Symmetry: C5
Subunit: 377 residues, 5 copies
């Protein structure tokens, strides 16, 4: 199955394979297998574009393999191809660690293969190309330069497994995945987990309900705050290869400015009767967002209350909550300079009252919910 290939020539970041000098370099550097040069024609707004391009001949798949020392960074790869066959063919994009998800390329048509490649730690780009595909252009470009984003249309097919990985430098990002599915089973799912997005922090991609035998479409939209100390992002399809619910999805990854999703004044009562109570106020871990606390106050405090502490943490960093305000020691409301950032869970720990005489206290809290899942540390 393996073949030998000559690889002496310097790699280019762009090839138009209908140019002789680009083709000559391509097949002495990153192309594996043989090719036949053919005249290729396809329609553009009713006009017929005609080029001579290399076509993969009958036999084993060809490959493109790049181990050269490209400039490090995250590349969007675009391969312009034309399927000369009268039947569909499939391609399995690299996506750094995919080997199951596919593109379906229709008979007698031009098609854009999108791929993603992180050049770090000697990573080697690899993709196989089936017989009858003409290769017209091959493009390597770094994304997140000059304000570009990853924007892959809804063409990625999965049947329950697959991976896409990419490195993100510091910043906050939106990851958007338009999808369509076709449920072929008689099973009704509720809270169907399609997949997860994670750094070393995990965000589940969940659909409220997928009706039996139904088809539908929607969009996943989540946000990651990349502090910068954990840059490798991993998307995994988790619902399981044999389920019978094929999805087709797109992938958009783009830098955003701060997004305050909402700001809220909230109130929570706690009744104390002799025992310590730990009351969750808010937990947005795994949601694609985090919190910022601006103000807190507790009413109903009496000498019968022995403990009343507001605690918070970044659960992706630590499961141990730290006290951010002590209403007994510090007073019934937070001072003007009090501002709690980079947390995603808040609880109130209180104690007091008796088994015969309970005390009810009321916490009020003003907080912002801000886009971006917090990373591990």
């Amino acid at each position: 199955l393996g073949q030998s290939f000559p690889a002496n020539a310097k790699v280019k970041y762009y090839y138009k394979l209908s140019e002789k000098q680009d083709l000559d370099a391509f097949v002495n550097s990153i192309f594996v297998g043989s090719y036949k040069l053919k005249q290729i024609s396809y329609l553009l707004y009713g006009n017929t574009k005609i080029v001579s391009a290399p076509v993969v001949p009958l036999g084993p798949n060809a490959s493109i393999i790049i181990d050269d020392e490209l400039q490090e960074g995250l590349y969007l790869i675009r391969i312009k191809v034309y399927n000369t066959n009268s039947f569909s063919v499939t391609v399995t994009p690299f996506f750094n660690n995919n080997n199951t998800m596919t593109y379906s390329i229709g008979a007698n048509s031009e098609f854009e293969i999108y791929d993603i490649f992180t050049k770090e730690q000697g990573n080697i780009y690899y993709i196989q190309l089936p017989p009858g595909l003409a290769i017209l252009e091959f493009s390597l470009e770094r994304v997140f330069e000059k304000g570009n984003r990853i924007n892959i249309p809804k063409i990625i097919h999965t049947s329950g497994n697959g991976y896409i990985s990419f490195r993100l430098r510091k910043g906050t990002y939106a990851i958007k995945m338009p999808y369509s599915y076709n449920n072929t089973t008689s099973t009704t799912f509720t809270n169907f987990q399609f997949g997860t997005i994670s750094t070393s922090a995990t965000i589940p991609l969940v659909i409220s309900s997928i009706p039996a035998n139904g088809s539908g479409s929607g969009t996943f939209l989540v946000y990651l705050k990349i502090t910068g100390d954990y840059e490798d992002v991993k998307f995994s399809v988790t619902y399981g290869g044999g389920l019978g619910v094929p999805f087709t999805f797109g992938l958009e990854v783009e830098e955003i400015n701060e997004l305050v999703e909402n700001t809220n004044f909230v109130t929570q009562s706690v009744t104390l009767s002799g025992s310590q109570v730990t009351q969750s106020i808010l937990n947005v871990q795994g949601s694609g967002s985090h919190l910022r606390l601006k103000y807190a106050s507790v009413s109903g405090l009496t000498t019968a209350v022995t403990q009343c502490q507001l605690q918070a943490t970044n659960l992706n960093r630590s499961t141990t909550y730290s006290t951010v305000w002590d209403f007994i020691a510090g007073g019934s409301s937070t001072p003007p300079s009090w501002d709690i950032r980079e947390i995603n869970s808040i609880q109130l720990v209180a104690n007091g009252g008796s088994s015969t005489s309970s005390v009810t206290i009321t916490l009020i809290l003003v907080y912002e919910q801000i886009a971006g899942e917090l990373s591990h540390h």
Copy 2:
């Protein structure tokens, strides 16, 4: 109507078609149709510039078509042409989504065709060029690099329909459209909607009045805050093709720094007599702006008032208002750290008093109005 064309050569980002090597590449990549090479002369400050350039011959329009894998981004296209005809000709710029708006190119004159092209998702650039146009230069440049802006002069003609789309990366932008119109009808129009600017959020472009049989000019100026999760912007002319009010307009799109349009101390009374009241305080949705709340206070509170909550939202994200301060639970005025950002609508919800004994409360509010329509989420 369709023609075949050879497209083997690598596309360039700049062509001067009076250079042989540029012309040769141009007509083996992106130019459809035949040309005649002619000596072209035109005036610059009284001097006669003379070049040899390709001219579209009598017959079908020529086209420029680009499906090549250009670096992704938003391009400003400039085509320098010279109309060799003794009559005006028209061109229909691509603008990503336009096929009705035109440029009018005068007889025997040089002209700059401006176009806009978003290279994402395999988008294909397309423009037709009529017989007698000489094509002198063709330029592709990314805007919003190096602090550039889109700046098209007042030369775009519409008679009631048309579209222009473009991708904007994160940032706040001004969109300015200088216009002139001629109302050839005997009808005077009020709150005339010329068009809309939208992302997935909508801003109407409205003219207070257009006098019957009148002609006039003005400038639309609106702002978009692109968080970055919705980047595709769409301008639509909506007044209707057969109306009889031709407009000529320009388009300037440029990044801005934060613009505080004004800061205001405002007061609002509400009379309560037993029933819940929901009182709108401010709603700037669709205005090209948003709000920031700095301080609020309510006077006149008594035990007769059972509810008094200030609520706010980004209506482009959610029609459900969230409470941002509760004057009963939290006290009659907001604390120093209270600061409500990224909203565009505010209301007061209150209840109390009786059918026989009403209570009047007064809200005071300090807020900023900030340039930039908020996007959907």
Copy 3:
């Protein structure tokens, strides 16, 4: 007076005209007229530099004219020339809109012609060069790239009119103009307006006094805050062509970080006797600066005072003042979160007292004066 010229060749951003290939391109693209190639010598630190360069021959002026689709942006142009004449020659730089201000180039000397050119909306660069000038180098570079500034030495001559325009992207800029003048009149000028700097907002450049028959020097230094929605800046000399006060000046335009010019606690009393009073507190419109209010308080309020509102505005945006604090409705002092930005004029509107019993109130205000004239909106 007009001549024809061949313009087939691609324009370059740098030419050294003593190189044959640069000269060949230059005279087949942007140079109008004939030249004579001559050996040119001039002194550098006592050494004689020798080059062969094109010289404008006896006859009509030559021109440089550039209408090609250069990358858009603001260019600083430098032309290195050598005056082979035994007499002075003058050149009139383009400066986008100038046709009266001049450089005076001494006999038998090297000289740097600085020019400014905004490549937007098909703008065409144009400058004439008199006989006997050798053209050594021609340089086009974008400024405000890589932290560069416009820095033209004190060599620009005006006798009372002239214009320089340039586009500035978003940011705050200093505009500095070192000048010398010779008053050839016996008139003592008081508050002599030399010129103005404006966007669509105007800053007068004023000298306190110019003594009769006097000669002097100084520096204008003003600042513009370019929000980004109005980028075209225009400098105009306004004192009048026949006045008899020639100036020579330089031009430095450079981006700055925020500059707090001063912060002040100020007090203002107002006496009320039955009628509404509108008292100006501060107005810095047209000064090259704006204001930020941090704190305000009014003492002396009694039930005899019926109105006491602090109002502010950006006069370049609106002549209608908005209330920023109401001391009656809101209380005698501003809250911690009160912060009024982007204004340049403040007034107090008050009413109360009677014709027989006046009331005196005292406003205190803390504000910053910040560099940068606010733009129109």
Copy 4:
């Protein structure tokens, strides 16, 4: 041991040595010694890549030495090699200051040599290459351009000494070092110091425990705030060459945005009985973090307390603490604007009470702990 070498040719930032013109330049500039050109084959995804590349022949090691005036900055070097020997060979990377730590390159295999080189003050790059190594590619790239990071996999071998140095421009950085160790001794270690990271400020890299005869893996993760006045960072392995605990580690250096590790409300009592007490509250010097104080308050103050001052400092800058709040002179709690940044140690100095009548005061403090060791000044 030393050899002469020709070095006339300009240095390149990238060489692919299977290209004749790159090899020719390489061996007339930076390569020392002889080479034999050989056909080299190795496996990539089951395919056989074949190139002709220079191999170090039997005899003395070859060297690469670069003293040329490269653009200044910090370079990541990658050398793609292939070990043609049937035995392992070792290489000692430059790392600016290393001459003991090694890579181990397996028999008959391709390997990526990573190195680091700071081009400042005439620094000269140097690495030796043993016989039988084929050199395929040599890459010099600046890191921290375009959001790149240093990311070297876990392949660096130390047995108790070694240095790596690099220059960081202003910013905050994470330094992450995944490691594995093998303790060959019967000795049990506690608070094992592997090494230190320092600027002119020192951060110990410590392992809680290394069990006797144990092997283990973990990750060091520390942060440096580079103000910019001290840019040269030095990593030192300190545990001692003969210890018998070999480590293998990786190195990741990347820029981060502000990281609030946690925010805490803390309380501390101090009992006074006639003598001055200096009570440490918090000291995070050498931890890879610093502090920011937001609010402080002291309860229990009476006329019996004569001194109560909160003091802070950046210990890397100064061992003398400065008073940041005086609870006697200033009052029992800090004002809204009180905010103490860029410190890493806090203490309370207090005095009062008597030998017969003690007074207990309680300090409460709200502070953030922020990633980044503070530098010296």
Copy 5:
């Protein structure tokens, strides 16, 4: 002493003079004088690098002179040379304004000449090279691009005069100068001023004491806040040419992020007895730093105090202090929003009490000292 030189060829930003085409350009553009091509050898890690390079022959010094229109900006020049003489030679770097300070280049050794060149306003680079120096490479690179800094090692010799000038764009910068001195005199110095750093603002570089006949070393480290309106920085050695205290020093200029040097709570009493008192609180003008005031309070105010104003200024901008808080008119302590930036001198002006009954008031102040001398305006 002056020579003629041919200068037709375009200037390059990098020359390796052992390449024929680089040398050919070099000696037809910027090199003045004759050269002899010689085989040059020197040691690098025990290996002998051999190149053929131009050597200045016996006779007058050669010169490098550059008046060409290089891209504007601040350049670091590196000249790699080799002294073929068996005696030391000296070179005088340009440094924009130097003509006394020298490098000493040892016999038979390679050496890096560092120089600084501001390309603005037609500035011409100039340096003389003595007989016997081989010139191997010549490099022109803009600093402050890509996060580079000026970093010249301790090799600049002065005996009491000399200048270095450079342009800095907006930012805050550290200027670090490691130095060594030899006092050949038995004079012991106190507060020895070595030199000054200034913009149009001045910072003295002072050494506490220089013992008689002593030698020593140390480092000057000061900071400049470049707002951007004054960008030209001048370093002057001022101690005087004949003093007999030679220094050798290096120069490091690098951009920094905000540096809070310290934050302090300070107290100051003032006794009033009928006369106005102006009490200096803090003055850091000329120190390389500035202040920011966060909070102020005065205790001891009575009706016997008629004036109590805190005043501040940027003395580099204005010698007139402005009132920043009036404790009589405004109250005994500053409000939460009070924050005074960009000042470097604070005083309290007070009046009250009588010749027979004095009043003592106490000011408390919290302020930050921040790196960066403020510039003139």
